[PDB]
Amino acid sequence: VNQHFANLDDGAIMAVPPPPVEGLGNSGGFALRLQDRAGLGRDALLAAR
């Protein structure tokens, strides 16, 4: 599915497998929260992002 639709012209499309354990996330892998711990601001937040 990812190979067939890798060249979609209007938007983005992505196929993923379900997470191994229900209730611990939307998918497998890692989930990090980047935190504005110094109040750099939304523009600086998007720059660092």
Partner: peptide
Amino acid sequence: SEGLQAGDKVITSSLAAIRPGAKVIPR
């Protein structure tokens, strides 16, 4: 109103997946 002229080839697709100066295949 400004910034375009007749005959210009504008891209109407894949805009989010294209960076300035990148090479593309026109359909």
